[PDB]
Design a protein around this ligand. Structure first.
Ligand SMILES: *[C@@H]1O[C@H](CO[C@@H]2O[C@@H](C)[C@@H](O)[C@@H](O)[C@@H]2O)[C@@H](O[C@@H]2O[C@H](CO)[C@@H](O[C@@H]3O[C@H](CO)[C@@H](O)[C@H](O)[C@@H]3O)[C@H](O)[C@H]2NC(C)=O)[C@H](O)[C@H]1NC(C)=O
Ligand SMILES: CCCC[C@H](N[C@@H](CCc1ccccc1)C(=O)O)C(=O)N[C@@H](Cc1c[nH]c2ccccc12)C(=O)O
Ligand SMILES: *[C@@H]1O[C@H](CO)[C@@H](O[C@@H]2O[C@H](CO)[C@@H](O)[C@H](O)[C@H]2NC(C)=O)[C@H](O)[C@H]1NC(C)=O
Ligand SMILES: *[C@@H]1O[C@H](CO[C@@H]2O[C@@H](C)[C@@H](O)[C@@H](O)[C@@H]2O)[C@@H](O)[C@H](O)[C@H]1NC(C)=O
Ligand SMILES: [Cl-]
Ligand SMILES: [Mg+2]
Ligand SMILES: [Zn+2]
Length: 606
């Protein structure tokens, strides 16, 4: 470790811990920057030489975390929990958590190599037909989204899950063992326990289950309504009106957002078309425009614009040279208080416009708390970070706002239009809830040992059927590793944050609309240009993790806990409507024929 990066000596009292944290921040910013930079060089230009540089940067970070983690223990183990400065208690608590730095050198290198190899496998996988080969983004994504051929959709779904999942399984087994070994030395029973501890709630899993119980009826009714719509297009042979939906027919590779099948379920097509993708294309929208439109919403709230370093450094389009990239959208903080970037293979679609807002929500957070101690530069909890951009997109998606930005010529305020809009939003927000919930249930079982490698896929599809009510369109077995075909698994990114975010964003929305002075239906609110709403939001963003999220939340929404009532209130109209339609259509809610799988096409795969 560079001598300038090594910890000195500090008094074993709170006054010395303050200087300890100051010296830590100075050195930590340099170690974080070089690490994030090396990750950026790889993810924007996947080469072996850049992967090698990234693994060495990870080794340096582990060396740094070991020297400062063990110094923080030696000096402050019996007294840090009693410090008067609460932000300083949080800094020390983070520094003394070594994570992968608890591993011996050899296993550190194994650990860093696995993460690198797993990331490279996921982002370089292809579905070859043998020279012609399709990538996940854009090729397979567009097939899942715009194709209505059961066989073509099946080819892409099966192709992707086989190409990405199968080679990942042996690596994911080794990573899980090393991850658990590392965090067991921090005092956690397994890695999942460490991940859950970020929410500082002894009742976390019970609170999540109680939230999902309130939301499940909404998903069940949407599920039955969409399944009926698919049955009218695909027939009785490929859709079982009392069974799960084949997982490749919902517009998305993971059946996690159903927006792409809106055209098949829109109840009142005579009303304005809320899918403005065709208009964006007709008008000539490009990537940089989508980001400028997103930025302009943020500045309308008196939040910060994107700095020059963002526009000069960001990758907002898939490179057209001979570069392999990680196309999965992401927002980057380089921890130097200057460089902030988004990496996204942006496509001109309505859903991609929301993704742009989601990612810029991260950047805005980074910009607002960049002056806090490096350890406090994160969300109050990870769900907060995932909710910022989505709250703004809830206003952007309103028919009235789409009209203002020239994407919707006719604006109507009638009940039929309300149902159209709320159904479209439900295809995106309600359909996701089961998936956002189940991913880390699977990963928690893997970390705990409940789910050994011999049951990776068995338990994955138990949960997919249990919560989402979908089924694989081809037979699967334990050679397949379908969980690994989802970006966040090989990239080791927790997922429960997204379930928290989809509930939280409606709490934020309700509070910001109240703050803005809006007194109409919650789903028609648009906080555009509300400096008051911006001031309330800014207060959350500038807090970082300096304060417990329960208190940050109460200051914002008046409640110190996640609550599903705002989401239910947002959707009340279409919730009632979907129940009426399903009753009138004699639908069966749920999938009692849980064992059913669709047959294979007669001409498959040829
Ligand atoms: C779309 O339209 C709804 C409904 O509008 C209402 O019903 C129509 C059939 C007409 O009779 C309209 O004249 C009538 O307003 C709008 O929601 C409504 O917004 C108004 C404010 O613009 C609300 O009135 C306020 O209500 C609060 C109490 O909540 C009072 O304190 C205020 O003094 C004021 O009266 C009204 O409650 C609200 N109605 C419902 C059912 O939510 C909606 O704003 C509109 N959408 C857009 C984008 O304009
Ligand atoms: C909308 C943002 C998509 C990209 C995002 N990308 C991640 C980068 C993660 C990362 C961490 C560390 C290192 C590298 C990468 C992010 O920004 O959080 C993402 O993954 N969203 C989720 C859920 C979701 C939100 N809104 C939706 C709307 C519809 C459907 C799903 C979701 C998903 O798509 O599964
Ligand atoms: C992708 O990364 C590689 C490094 O792995 C870059 O290649 C280097 O380019 C510089 C200048 O062009 C040369 O001096 C080095 O010798 C190259 N190294 C290797 C290993 O080839 C490459 O330029 C990067 N590509 C992009 C588009 O940034
Ligand atoms: C796992 O399955 C692989 C692919 O074939 C699968 O099983 C056959 C019977 C068909 O149902 C087909 O649609 C499926 O995709 C096999 O190649 C592989 O041998 C299987 N692995 C084990 C361990 O049996
Ligand atoms: Cl999380
Ligand atoms: Mg779409
Ligand atoms: Zn995010």
């Amino acid at each position: 470790l560079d001598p300038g990066l090594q910890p000195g000596q500090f008094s074993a009292d709170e006054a010395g811990a303050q200087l300890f944290a100051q010296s830590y921040q100075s050195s930590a910013e340099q170690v974080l920057f070089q690490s994030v930079a090396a990750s950026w060089a790889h993810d924007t230009n996947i080469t072996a030489e850049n992967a090698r540089r990234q693994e060495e940067a990870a080794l340096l970070s582990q060396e740094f975390a070991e020297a400062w983690g063990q110094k923080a223990k030696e000096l402050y183990e019996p007294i840090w929990q009693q410090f008067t400065d609460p932000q300083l208690r949080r800094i020390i608590g983070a520094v003394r958590t070594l994570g992968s730095a608890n591993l011996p050198l050899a296993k550190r290198q194994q650990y860093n190599a696995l993460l690198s190899q797993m990331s490279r496998i996921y982002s370089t996988a292809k579905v070859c037909l043998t020279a012609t080969c399709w990538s996940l983004d854009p090729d397979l994504t567009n097939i899942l989204a715009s194709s209505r051929s059961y066989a073509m959709l099946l080819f892409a779904w099966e192709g992707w899950h086989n190409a990405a999942g199968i080679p990942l399984k042996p690596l994911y087994e080794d990573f899980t063992a090393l991850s658990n070994e590392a965090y067991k030395q921090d005092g956690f029973t397994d890695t999942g326990a460490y991940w859950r501890s970020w929410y500082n709630s002894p009742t976390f899993e019970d609170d999540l289950e109680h939230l999902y119980q309130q939301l499940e009826p909404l998903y069940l009714n949407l599920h039955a309504f969409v399944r009926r719509a698919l049955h009218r297009r695909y027939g009785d042979r490929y859709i079982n009106l009392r069974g799960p939906i084949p997982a490749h027919l919902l517009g998305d590779m993971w059946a996690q957002s159903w927006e792409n099948i809106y055209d098949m379920v829109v109840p009142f097509p005579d009303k304005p078309n809320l899918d403005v993708t065709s208009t964006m294309l007709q008008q000539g929208w490009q990537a940089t425009h989508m980001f400028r439109v997103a930025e302009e919403f943020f500045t309308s709230l008196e939040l910060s614009p994107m700095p020059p370093e963002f526009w000069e450094g960001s990758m907002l389009e898939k490179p057209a040279d001979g570069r392999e990239v990680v196309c999965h959208a992401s927002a980057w903080d380089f921890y130097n208080r200057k460089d902030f970037r988004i990496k996204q293979c942006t496509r001109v679609t309505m859903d991609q416009l929301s993704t742009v807002h989601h990612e810029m929500g991260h950047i805005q957070y980074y910009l607002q708390y960049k002056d806090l101690p490096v350890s406090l530069r994160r969300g109050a909890n990870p769900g907060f970070h995932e909710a910022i951009g989505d709250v703004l997109a809830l206003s952007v998606s309103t028919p009235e706002h789409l009209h203002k930005i020239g994407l919707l010529d006719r604006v109507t305020n009638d009940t039929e239009s309300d149902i159209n809009y709320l159904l479209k939003m439900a295809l995106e927000k309600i359909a996701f809830l089961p998936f956002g919930y189940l991913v880390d249930q699977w990963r928690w079982g893997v970390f705990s040992g409940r789910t050994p490698p011999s049951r990776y896929n068995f338990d994955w599809w138990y949960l997919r059927t249990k919560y989402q009510g979908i089924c694989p369109p081809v037979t699967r077995n334990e050679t397949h590793f379908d969980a690994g075909a989802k970006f966040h698994v090989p990239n080791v990114t927790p997922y429960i944050r997204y379930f928290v975010s989809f509930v939280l964003q409606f709490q934020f929305h309700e509070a910001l609309c109240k703050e803005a002075g809006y007194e109409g239906p919650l789903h028609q609110c648009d906080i555009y240009r509300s400096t008051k709403a911006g001031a309330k939001l800014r207060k959350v963003l500038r807090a970082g993790s300096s304060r417990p999220w329960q208190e940050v939340l109460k200051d914002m929404v008046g409640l110190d806990a996640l609550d599903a009532q705002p989401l239910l209130k947002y959707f009340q109209l279409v919730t009632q409507w979907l129940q009426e339609q399903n009753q009138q259509n004699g639908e069966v809610l749920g999938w009692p024929e849980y064992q059913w799988h669709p047959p294979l096409p007669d001409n498959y795969p040829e």
